TrEMBL record, chains A, B:
Span of domain Thiolase C-terminal: 298-428
InterPro entries: Thiolase, Thiolase-like, Thiolase_C_2, Thiolase_CS, Thiolase_N
Pfam family, one: Thiolase_C_1
SUPFAM superfamilies: Thiolase-like
Annotated protein name in UniProt: propanoyl-CoA C-acyltransferase
Keyword annotations from UniProtKB, A to Z: Acyltransferase, Lipid transport, Lipid-binding, Transferase, Transport
Length: 430, 430
């Protein structure tokens, strides 16, 4: 196979309610200035990604662009982000010369796995001989509607005919439903999930890019002792299993990554041992049936398939991983992800979180920058963000949450819907 | 490079207002029976495609699935069609064994070029060594809303902030605007575009799959002499340049194609010279800037770039083509497509249509089954339909519209938005 290299990338701040970067009634610039649009975020992400990757002034050597985005058609009335990305380099500079003109571009989608799917597409282009350098960007804007209205948009990721009726907050409810079963089988507890949140917010507190950077929450708060941490669902059956702090954020943001094969490195004037690089040893996608759910809510069968293929293609095992990024769309999902990735055996994610093994100082740090819970979750961006966080830790770029032991191996696990699409990648430092 | 072969495929009937297959108040089964949902169309298309490709009972050898769809999230409240496709083989047969489980799948999107993009993704997977057999299906349901509401959904293909205000029928208006400029430069006429429609409806009349199969229109009717062929736009500046008969249909439908590399043919027990095959010699994508339009409305620069790359990679010229499928989203676009493909020189599409060169009996027949105008336009399906129509002509399957001279070489040209994304492929008979 042709090898694949992460050359560089960019994560915007992730912003929404609770961030000082978000312009609401509590902001100096309220009334004066607006938050970024989808087009603006896409422009910032594309330009930021080119800059960090050392391509400013030679963007014409990028052969192709893939955008990951889930709901731009709903939140921003805008599809067709392929040609949006082609215009993103020189956005708002009318008539300007554009070195991306006529290149291939498209949007890919699998709910919150859209970013990961974007990386896969780019990687297939690189191994197919139709590209030597690709740009994969993911973006999302979700703050243009309430959390309730957004919850109906996010339900586009579920089997909508079958599952929308559970609750206006369809996804939160689907994970609350997992938690009920999880509790009845004593797989792990609501204490355990509160410990996940405490970790995430503590990690976020060290990350200025994080949506929840300025919010502090104690274990006790996340564990429900605060009455402002409401059990907000409407469905009576599942209401008691989910608190606000268990939920990923409604965020706006972008993440981008430039990927290259060996011929692309050559073109950029780079060697395969260049210390700015990280190798993607493997990536893998697994998709289950939208229309049918397994009974065992304590196992994410699809995410487990993806993680298994990826580590296998990389010829490593979970115990070899030094860092991971997992899809904590809820605290409940982070626990399940530990077991789907394999860093915990079935029923033993509880051990890991009770023992601090996934904190910054633990033996397998996870979601070092705050996860979907604190860093935030602009759905389309998440999958690429995960890649870039492992990259940044590997390159010593994470500042206040930088790991003291630079990780040699990392893994990502990105998930769309209720474990219906999963994408997992193994990353090796250089 | 690994070679790529079309093994087989399937087009559903394309249905909507005017079709006897469409169930509205005037239909015997009104109240009794409903039109197909997006899920049902996807199930029919996936199963139909497997059947005609010879894979029934061994669907497990398909390595991957790519779905093309533009607006399912809006018209049907449904995204995440990747796992929908995974469950499409056994749709409505609960608990059944499913040989597609855990395979890679995703949805791709570039407005009305979504189907073509789906083929490109599949083809990259085939050349990348991550697949030997791929299934590319495209589907769309647009009849769940009024034409006016649908026109706002379709505007997701435009630069929405900039262009939505032109008209509720944003896309029709954008092509009407082209026609104004086209008229002022005498590039071609509204008689010429009526001749395109006459050809499409005559072709449709020989195609039972065609939305408009049962509607007959004379040149004179398409040319405006019928008062029911109304100039329906609201925008005063462009209103006079577009008639209803100039417009593609609001259709529901699906198309699917199985593609394979040489190892995939081996796996299916097939030889590369098997007469059921067509080789995709080349495919190419070109994407321009969503945010800026070129001045010259008489040229589709982006579609021309894509056609040029494809014919060049295939080392052929337009004059070598025996058949073509082009993106006649409007009659106006068919004319521009003849020139973008290269079968007419700049300003000479008028010669071709005045001379009958693109009729079934002409030297370069185009859109033999009726095009987006008559066959209809379920947006995500269109790109794959185009591929399958060239295939079917090449394999002698088109019955009443079958070409008497079996074509050796064909080309497709699929377009998203106002010439912002284009995909073009060269096909060679075996
Ligand atoms: C695979 C994947 O990645 S899935 C994608 C996953 N993402 C999601 O599901 C998004 C999850 N996150 C969210 O929806 C948001 O972060 C939330 C809802 C958890 C927090 O949002 P906020 O804006 O802080 O909450 P908000 O104030 O809108 O209120 C939420 C609801 O909680 C309830 N609520 C709020 N405060 C109270 C209270 N004091 N008492 C009772 N109910 C309350 C209400 O029902 C309220 O809705 P309402 O105003 O319509 O009646
Ligand atoms: C670029 C790509 O390839 S992607 C997308 C493809 N392109 C498109 O957008 C085409 C899709 N849209 C269409 O083509 C149009 O929706 C149509 C014209 C085909 C739909 O026509 P129909 O639905 O059969 O007729 P319908 O009755 O809705 O007429 C549409 C509108 O035209 C006007 N109209 C309809 N009938 C009449 C009449 N007898 N007299 C005057 N005006 C009329 C009306 O404004 C009507 O809207 P309204 O009912 O709110 O007033």
């Amino acid at each position: 196979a042709s090898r694949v290299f992460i050359v560089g990338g960019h994560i915007t701040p992730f912003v929404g309610k609770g961030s000082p970067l978000f312009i609401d009634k509590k902001h100096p610039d309220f009334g004066k200035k607006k938050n970024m649009t989808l087009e603006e975020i896409l422009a910032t992400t594309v330009q930021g990604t080119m800059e960090h990757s050392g391509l400013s002034g030679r963007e014409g050597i990028v052969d192709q662009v893939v955008v990951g985005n889930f709901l731009g058609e709903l939140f921003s009335s805008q599809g067709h982000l392929g040609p949006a990305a082609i215009g993103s380099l020189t956005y708002g500079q009318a008539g300007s010369k554009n070195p991306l003109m006529y290149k291939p571009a498209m949007r890919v989608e699998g709910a919150a796995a859209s970013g990961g799917l974007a990386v896969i597409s780019a990687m297939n282009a690189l191994k197919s001989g139709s590209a030597d350098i690709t740009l994969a960007v993911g973006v999302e804007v979700q703050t243009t509607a309430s959390a309730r209205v957004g919850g109906d948009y996010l339900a586009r990721a579920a089997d909508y005919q079958r599952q929308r009726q559970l609750d206006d907050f369809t996804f939160p409810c689907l994970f609350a439903k997992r938690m009920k079963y999880i509790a009845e089988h004593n797989h792990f507890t609501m204490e355990d999930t509160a410990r996940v949140a405490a970790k995430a917010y503590a990690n976020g507190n060290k990350n200025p890019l994080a949506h929840m950077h300025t919010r502090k929450l104690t274990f006790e708060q996340c564990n429900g002792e605060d009455p402002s941490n409401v059990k907000f669902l409407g469905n009576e059956t599942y209401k008691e299993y989910l608190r606000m702090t268990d939920c990923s954020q409604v965020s706006d943001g972008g993440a981008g990554v430039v990927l290259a094969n060996e011929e692309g490195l050559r073109k950029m004037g780079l060697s395969p041992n260049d210390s700015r690089l990280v190798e993607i040893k493997s990536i893998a996608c697994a998709v289950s049936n939208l229309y049918e759910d397994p009974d065992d809510a304590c196992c994410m069968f699809t995410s487990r398939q993806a993680a298994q293929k990826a580590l296998s293609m990389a010829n490593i095992k979970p115990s070899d991983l030094n860092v991971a990024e997992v899809h904590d769309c809820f605290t409940i999902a982070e626990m399940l992800m530990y077991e789907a990735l394999g860093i915990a055996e079935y029923g033993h994610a509880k051990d890991l979180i009770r023992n601090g093994d996934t904190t910054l100082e633990g033996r397998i740090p996870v979601n070092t920058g705050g996860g979907l819970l604190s860093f935030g979750h602009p759905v389309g961006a998440t999958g690429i963000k995960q890649i870039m966080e492992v990259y940044r830790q590997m390159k010593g770029q994470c500042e206040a949450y930088q790991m003291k032991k630079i990780p040699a191996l990392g893994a990502t696990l990105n998930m769309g819907g209720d474990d219906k699409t999963a994408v997992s990648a193994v990353l090796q430092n250089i």
